Amino acid sequence: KKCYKLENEKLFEEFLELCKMQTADHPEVVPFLYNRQQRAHSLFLASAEFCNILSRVLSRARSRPAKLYVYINELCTVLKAHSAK
Amino acid sequence: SENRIAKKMLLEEIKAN
């Protein structure tokens, strides 16, 4: 039933809405995140592993957003490690 | 704070990139 491709896009898009709201004083942060996502292997972006990662990150972002940049860093790090280049 | 340093580190990486 689960389509990880669409689920990951949903989870990532939900996370970015939080980021947009809470990083408005540093406008370069959000495009950087999109850039990291843009450059990752699309199969990784559609993977169950990425889904699991996004679930944890978004969960932490929702319950404890005082460490948002921590979470942002995790996500950027993971995405860099799966860069298509 | 952990978040402060995380923020500082991310911003520097962006500026460097």
Numbering used by the authors:
A (entry chain A): 56 to 140
B (entry chain B): 1267 to 1283
What did the published study say regarding this structure?
Alpha-thalassemia/mental retardation syndrome X-linked protein (ATRX) is a member of the switch 2/sucrose nonfermentable 2 (SWI2/SNF2) family of chromatin-remodeling proteins. ATRX deposits histone variant H3.3 into heterochromatin loci with the cooperation of an H3.3-specific chaperone, the death-domain associated protein (DAXX). The DAXX helical bundle (DHB) domain has been shown to interact with two modules of ATRX. The DAXX-ATRX interaction is a crucial link to bridge the chaperone-activity domain of DAXX and the remodeling-activity domain of ATRX together to deposit H3.3 into heterochromatin foci.
We determined the structure of the DAXXDHB–ATRXDBM complex at a resolution of 2.2 Å using single-wavelength anomalous dispersion with selenomethionine-substituted crystals. The final refined model covered DAXX residues 57–141 and ATRX residues 1,267–1,284. DAXXDHB forms an elongated helix bundle with four antiparallel packed helices α1, α2, α4, and α5. α3 is a short helix connecting α2 and α4, and it crosses the base of the helical bundle. ATRXDBM exists as a long amphipathic helix (residues 1,269–1,283) lying along the cleft between helices α2 and α5 of DAXXDHB. ATRXDBM binding does not induce large conformational change in DAXXDHB, because the DAXXDHB structure in the complex is almost identical to the previously determined NMR structure of apo DAXXDHB, with a root-main-square deviation (rmsd) value of 1.0 Å for 83 equivalent Cα pairs. The interaction between DAXXDHB and ATRXDBM is predominantly mediated by hydrophobic contacts. Four nonpolar residues (A1272, L1276, L1277, and I1280) in the center of the ATRXDBM helix constitute a hydrophobic core that fits snugly into a shallow groove in DAXXDHB. The side chains of these residues make close contacts with a panel of hydrophobic amino acids, including V84, F87, Y124, V125, and I127 of DAXX. Complementary with the hydrophobic contacts, a series of salt bridges and hydrogen-bonding interactions further strengthened the interactions between DAXXDHB and ATRXDBM. Moreover, our structural analyses of DAXXDHB-ATRXDBM and DAXXDHB-RASSF1CDBM indicate that DAXXDHB is a general protein-interaction domain with sufficient structural plasticity to accommodate DBMs from different interaction partners.
